Design a protein around this ligand. Structure first.
Ligand SMILES: O=C1CC(CN(Cc2ccccc2)C2CC2)=NC(=O)N1
Length: 161
């Protein structure tokens, strides 16, 4: 069903998080961690303190899809073998956020064409810079479009709220 998912998403905040490649999403899915540049680190840390749930919705650049979504379980904290763009050092990252995956299934952008994000001029929700906040209603409907991930049990995540 969808009821535990809706409960986790109640009064949540949502952020569009880009990845430079699939490998970093794979690492994040395996290890339950993510890192960012300091600008988005500050934004996500403020959000983590503000809301019962902060949801990261991931999209690998140029993939035309979202690769899943996860809930922050921690503020950032200060090596993980991330695959970084040429010229970027690990020292340019902020701290590491712990995350609990809610859905590891993909959703193509074609399936979210009917959702617009008020915090990005009501452009389609797939459009946004890395770190763009997605308004509650749009973000909830976007998460509900993903195929159910029957491998995940949200019992444990509800307890962290
Ligand atoms: O475009 C991105 C990609 C990305 C993946 N990073 C490396 C990186 C961080 C910031 C910019 C470019 C690459 C691995 C998880 C530590 N994390 C983001 O937060 N935004």
């Amino acid at each position: 069903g969808t009821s535990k998912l809706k409960y986790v998403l109640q009064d949540a905040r949502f952020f569009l998080i880009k990845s430079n490649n699939h490998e970093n999403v794979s690492l994040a899915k395996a290890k339950g961690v993510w890192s960012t540049l300091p600008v988005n680190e500050k934004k996500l840390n403020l959000a983590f303190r503000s809301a019962r749930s902060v949801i990261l919705i991931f999209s690998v650049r140029e993939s035309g899809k979202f690769q899943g979504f996860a809930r922050l379980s921690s503020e950032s904290h200060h090596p993980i073998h991330w695959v970084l763009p040429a010229g970027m050092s690990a020292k340019m990252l902020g701290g590491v956020f712990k995350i609990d995956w809610i859905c590891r299934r993909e959703l193509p952008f074609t399936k979210s064409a009917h959702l617009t994000n008020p915090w990005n001029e009501h452009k389609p929700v797939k459009i946004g810079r890395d770190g763009q906040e997605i308004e509650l209603e749009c973000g909830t409907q976007l998460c509900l479009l993903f195929p159910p991930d029957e491998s995940i049990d949200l019992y444990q995540v509800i307890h962290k709220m």
